[PDB]
Amino acid sequence: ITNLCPFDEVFNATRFASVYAWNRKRISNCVADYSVLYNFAPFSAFKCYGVSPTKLNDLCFTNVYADSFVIRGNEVSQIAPGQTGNIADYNYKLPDDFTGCVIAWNSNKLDSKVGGNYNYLYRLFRKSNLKPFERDISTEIYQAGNKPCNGVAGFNCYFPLRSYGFRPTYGVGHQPYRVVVLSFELLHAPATVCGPKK
Amino acid sequence: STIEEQAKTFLDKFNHEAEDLFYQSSLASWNYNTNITEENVQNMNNAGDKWSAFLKEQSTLAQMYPLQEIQNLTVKLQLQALQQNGSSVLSEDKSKRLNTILNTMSTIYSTGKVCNPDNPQECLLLEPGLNEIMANSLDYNERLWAWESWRSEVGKQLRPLYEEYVVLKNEMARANHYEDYGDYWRGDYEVNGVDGYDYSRGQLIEDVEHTFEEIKPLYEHLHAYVRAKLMNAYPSYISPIGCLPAHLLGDMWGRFWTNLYSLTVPFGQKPNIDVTDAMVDQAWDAQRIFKEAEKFFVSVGLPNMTQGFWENSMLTDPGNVQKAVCHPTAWDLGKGDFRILMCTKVTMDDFLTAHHEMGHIQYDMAYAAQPFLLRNGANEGFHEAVGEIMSLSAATPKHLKSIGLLSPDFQEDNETEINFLLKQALTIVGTLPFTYMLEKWRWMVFKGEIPKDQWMKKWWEMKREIVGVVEPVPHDETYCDPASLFHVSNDYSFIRYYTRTLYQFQFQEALCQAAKHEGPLHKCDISNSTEAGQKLFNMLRLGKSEPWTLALENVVGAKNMNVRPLLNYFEPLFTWLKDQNKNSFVGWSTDWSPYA
Ligand SMILES: *[C@@H]1O[C@H](CO)[C@@H](O[C@@H]2O[C@H](CO)[C@@H](O)[C@H](O)[C@H]2NC(C)=O)[C@H](O)[C@H]1NC(C)=O
Ligand SMILES: *[C@@H]1O[C@H](CO)[C@@H](O)[C@H](O)[C@H]1NC(C)=O
Ligand SMILES: *[C@@H]1O[C@H](CO)[C@@H](O)[C@H](O)[C@H]1NC(C)=O
Ligand SMILES: *[C@@H]1O[C@H](CO)[C@@H](O)[C@H](O)[C@H]1NC(C)=O
Ligand SMILES: *[C@@H]1O[C@H](CO)[C@@H](O)[C@H](O)[C@H]1NC(C)=O
Ligand SMILES: *[C@@H]1O[C@H](CO)[C@@H](O)[C@H](O)[C@H]1NC(C)=O
Ligand SMILES: *[C@@H]1O[C@H](CO)[C@@H](O)[C@H](O)[C@H]1NC(C)=O
Ligand SMILES: [Zn+2]
């Protein structure tokens, strides 16, 4: 039992990353207790796109990835294979062959402020859609127009990143939502992460 | 590479920025209105100034997209809404002059007082203190004094102000590619780009009149009955053959004949349905009233209220150490923030107003999914009509009998529906001629058939004919009678109320046909009818994304403003008035005047 995974750190972290700079944690070699995935009892959406959660703590994989970020309430449905929108296209893209889980819970009490919590960003403008499981943290003026922007944000030259201004009085569709998506990489290697030895 | 996609990207940026700043401004305004203090005023002004500056910057940025090559109705409509120049098209001197003229008129109307030469310490403002004289007094001479003094001290002093206002606003409209400021106001209904649903700015003029020639019989019979009920109150002062004197209407300008109910009540012995005593005996509070309102809205099929609405809204007066505005309002702060501001008491009127305001909020929730610029009613008359049909269906005896306020033993004798319809007609159909005539006069003044030499001469000439109201004193050109009203000297269109009144009954009759109603229209309750709720929601969720003709067709089934539902609503009252008007002249002769 003294090989517990760092899930209790990724779910309970006091600082989640922005969706455009989502944080990836590599769970490498330790006992994967998938039954402790109830840190926040009212999970808004705990949806597994692969093995069922009942059978989750039984399979053995070679690597686990935990991609953690914070998005809007109505933008949670975009964390799914084959979705469109700002998050899926320019911020975080999940492949249609995704094997893993998506765990999103409301965090209005944590990631909101009375004056507006302008600490979470998202990429509003991008030249082309993101490929699955690849990131883009560059802050370069998006040339919507045709005249060269010359690196100056003006007419037809937009800064690509816009801030989620989170406030506690928002509706549940505009309130902060912390999302951790677990991707279970099973590869041609010995399966390090295993289920509890119960 | 094309303007249509650069415009889309610009709108994508503008939607988010505008939503953020608008939410900040609305939150500041709400914090002021519920917590009247000193620093809240500065917060509200700063937020409003920031919002206005951002709106002006985005408006001047949106001019670079010609809108001619944008073959997408949604983007074109959003840019057209965002591209309006407004007062920023004239010279700075002329714009400053117009702003000063508007502010002076607004302040002098707000600070309007009455001077009594008999006693200098008898100053009264338009605040209800003067309103009891024009709404409850039974003295011809006192009412005449109040009317004449108000038209002499405020009306006479707003003549050159309005005279220069007309010229400045006409210049603004002509610089804004409109033949008139009246054309500017009529542009709130213009629809172009979509085939079959096109509707012209001038097409309003021939429609509002076309739906008014069918109002003349019912309003004429109502006027005849009201007149017949005023010779007994005012002997030898009404002249049955003649018109109604202007200062005896139960209101300062005769907008609503609501206060005439106590004088022209059909059956005095029978009373009105007043469940105030029942709902104060059953230990009801504001929270219970709003819970019943959302129960009604869920029963009809619409979604219930947001969880944040119950904790953020102010439903009961906090007046222990605080101040607020008593006006019941519905607030759409943006980003899923919906609130209701009213000092609700245990009263039937508060029940109906809660239903009306929560209908406003339900409409806001319905079109909350649309982009920021398209988050409004399909035209200026849909918010108020949608809110009003809720109170229309809430006040029926079969709804109060269901919720328990009216005990399930009430007998609806046919003498009581006559009282109810007459009370409601003194407010609903008693304002249509006044609204139509005032808006027509103001349109004619703006466009130019009425010269400044004949501003008064036409105003009463219309008032003696369209609405059948005769002045008691021969006002000269010095006076400005149609400037004393609140809406006229405040940059507010007034045909909105006419269109709202017609849309109210159109929507009500449509949702009754969807609810399998059987009897008369005035006994309709659309509760527990998911069909009516779905039919209404189809139009509610559209917002401005579709032409108002299409939205009206989404519920009514006809893409034009029709008056027949209104006449169907008052049909029993119309029959009773026709029977009751025997042995009494129906109509009026303009060739009479009390002063002569
Ligand atoms: C709409 O339906 C409701 C129930 O579905 C009815 O209102 C009352 O509901 C209480 C619930 O305990 C019951 O006494 C009856 O079902 C109803 N009472 C009466 C006197 O009708 C009613 O059918 C509808 N409510 C309205 C129209 O307000
Ligand atoms: C999880 O975080 C909370 C703070 O929200 C704190 O009690 C502690 O860091 C964690 N709780 C545990 C490990 O029980
Ligand atoms: C809001 O009202 C309360 C009184 O209950 C008081 O704190 C003050 O008047 C207002 N708040 C602020 C921050 O001004
Ligand atoms: C117009 O643009 C909007 C937003 O991009 C799009 O949803 C709509 O489909 C477009 N109109 C047509 C006819 O495709
Ligand atoms: C607003 O002003 C601009 C400035 O040239 C003008 O081109 C345009 O026609 C005006 N009217 C609009 C945008 O409706
Ligand atoms: C509203 O209805 C929903 C069901 O869709 C549910 O949250 C609950 O019954 C109601 N919530 C509130 C706050 O009224
Ligand atoms: C309907 O009302 C009339 C008077 O308005 C009355 O004479 C008649 O008896 C009523 N019908 C009834 C009570 O059935
Ligand atoms: Zn209102």
Atom of ligand 4 nearest to the CA of B8: 5
- Which residues does chain B have within 8 Å of residue A173's beta carbon, measured at their own beta carbons? 336
Give the pair of three-digit tokens for residue B67.
Answer: 């809108």
**Crossing angle between the packed helical segments B495-513 and B432-447, to the nearest 10 degrees:** 140
Domains of chain A, residue spans: 7-124+163-185
- The C-alpha atoms of residue A7 and residue B429 are separated, in whole angstroms, by 69
Task: Name residue B152's amino acid.
Answer: S
Residue found by looking up tokens 């949702």 in the block: B511
Show the 3-state SS of A65-124: EEEEEEECCCCHHHCCCCCCCHHHHHHCCCCCCCCEEEEEEECCCCCCCCCCEEEEEEEC
Length of chain B: 596
Distance from CA of A125 to the nearest CA of B (A): 8
Q: Chain A: residue nearest B28 by CA?
A: A115
DSSP calls for B64-86: TS-SSS---HHHHHHHHHHT--G
CB of B347 closer than 8 Å to CB of B358:
no
- List the resolution, Å: 2.9
- Is B357 catalytic? The answer is yes
Contacts of A11 (CB under 8 A, 6+ apart): A37, A39, A40, A103, A180
Q: How many domains does chain B have?
A: 1
- The C-alpha atoms of residue A120 and residue A165 are separated, in whole angstroms, by 8
DSSP calls for B116-172: -SS-SS--EETTHHHHHHHHH---HHHHHHHHHHHIIIIIGGGHHHHHHHHHHHHHH
SS3 B339: strand
Is ligand 5 within 6 A of the CB of residue B59? Answer: no
The answer to whether the annotation marks B151 as part of a ligand binding site is: yes
Give the pair of three-digit tokens for residue A167.
Answer: 């406030």
- The C-alpha atoms of residue A50 and residue A63 are separated, in whole angstroms, by 15
Residue found by looking up tokens 């809404």 in the block: B81
Query: Which residues' Cβ are closer than 6 Å to ligand 7?
Result: B 414-415
- The C-alpha atoms of residue B246 and residue B431 are separated, in whole angstroms, by 14
CB of B123 closer than 8 Å to CB of B448:
no
Q: Tell me how many residue pairs between chain A and chain B have CB atoms under 8 A apart.
A: 49
Show the 3-state SS of B478-515: CCCHHHCCCCHHHCCCCHHHHHHHHHHHHHHHHHHHCC
A146 close contact with B: CB closer than 8 A: yes
DSSP calls for B112-130: -EE--SS-SS--EETTHHH
Give the pair of three-digit tokens for residue A110.
Answer: 């944590």
Contacts of B542 (CB under 8 A, 6+ apart): B367, B370, B378, B550, B551, B554
User: What is the B35 CA–ligand 3 centroid distance (Å)?
Assistant: 6
- The C-alpha atoms of residue B399 and residue A18 are separated, in whole angstroms, by 51
Please answer yes or no on whether A156 and B10 come within 8 Å at the CB atom. Answer: yes
Sheet of A100-106: strands edge to edge? A23-27, A63-71, A177-185, A100-106, A45-48
The answer to whether the annotation marks B356 as part of a ligand binding site is: yes
Distance from CA of A12 to the nearest CA of B (A): 26
Which of A1, A189, A33, A184 is closest to A102 using CA atoms? A184
Give the pair of three-digit tokens for residue B115.
Answer: 């001077």
Please answer yes or no on whether B335 and A170 come within 8 Å at the CB atom. Answer: yes
Rounded to the nearest angstrom, the gap between the alpha carbon of residue B368 and the centroid of all alpha carbons in its chain is: 22
Atom of ligand 3 nearest to the CA of B322: 4
Please answer yes or no on whether B9 and A162 come within 8 Å at the CB atom. Answer: no
- The C-alpha atoms of residue A110 and residue A176 are separated, in whole angstroms, by 8
- The C-alpha atoms of residue B166 and residue B362 are separated, in whole angstroms, by 38
- Which residues does chain A have within 8 Å of residue B337's beta carbon, measured at their own beta carbons? 169-171
CB of B511 closer than 8 Å to CB of B390:
no
CB neighbours of residue A33 within 10 Å: 17
**Crossing angle between the packed helical segments B159-175 and B92-110, to the nearest 10 degrees:** 140
CB of B289 closer than 8 Å to CB of B350:
yes
Burial of B519 (0-12, 13-18, 19+ CB in 10 A): exposed
The answer to whether the annotation marks B399 as part of a ligand binding site is: no
Long-range contacts of B46-51 (CB under 8 A, 24+ apart): B50/B21, B50/B24, B50/B25, B51/B21, B51/B22, B51/B24, B51/B25
Contacts of A37 (CB under 8 A, 6+ apart): A7, A11, A46, A101, A103
Q: Is the dihedral of CA B120, B126, B129, B134 positive or negative?
A: positive
- The C-alpha atoms of residue B525 and residue B529 are separated, in whole angstroms, by 9
- Is B475 catalytic? The answer is no
Residue A61's DSSP bridge partners are A193
Give the pair of three-digit tokens for residue A164.
Answer: 């989620």
Assigned architecture for domain A7-124+163-185 = 2-Layer Sandwich (3.30)
User: What is the B359 CA–ligand 5 centroid distance (Å)?
Assistant: 37
Is ligand 6 within 6 A of the CB of residue B304? Answer: yes
- The C-alpha atoms of residue B41 and residue B244 are separated, in whole angstroms, by 45
Distances, alpha carbon B304 to alpha carbons A72, B290, B309, B332, in Å: 22, 11, 10, 16
DSSP calls for B31-65: HHHHS--SHHHHHHHHHHHHHHHHHHHHHHHHTTS
Please answer yes or no on whether A173 and B307 come within 8 Å at the CB atom. Answer: no
Which of B319, B320, B338 is closest to B329 using CA atoms? B338
Task: Name residue A173's amino acid.
Answer: G
The residue annotated as part of the active site, out of B292, B357, B439, B471, is B357
Which of B534, B535, B539, B532 is closest to B515 using CA atoms? B532
Burial of B482 (0-12, 13-18, 19+ CB in 10 A): buried
Task: Name residue A156's amino acid.
Answer: N
Which of B540, B295, B305, B257 is closest to B423 using CA atoms? B257
- Which residues does chain B have within 8 Å of residue A158's beta carbon, measured at their own beta carbons? 9, 13
CA atoms within 13 A on the CB side of B552: 24
The CA-to-CA distance between both ends of chain B, in Å, stands at: 75
CB neighbours of residue B453 within 10 Å: 8
DSSP calls for B528-572: T-HHHHHHHHHHHTTTTSS-HHHHHHTTTS-SS--SHHHHHHTHH
Please answer yes or no on whether B308 and A171 come within 8 Å at the CB atom. Answer: yes
Q: Which ligand is nearest to the CA of B405?
A: 1
Length of chain A: 198
Q: Is the dihedral of CA B310, B314, B316, B320 positive or negative?
A: positive
Ligand 5 atom 2: residue of nearest CA: B85
Q: What is the DSSP letter of A17?
A: P
- Which residues does chain A have within 8 Å of residue B13's beta carbon, measured at their own beta carbons? 124-125, 158, 162
Q: Which range of residues forms the domain containing residue B158?
A: 1-596
DSSP calls for A133-145: T--------EE-S
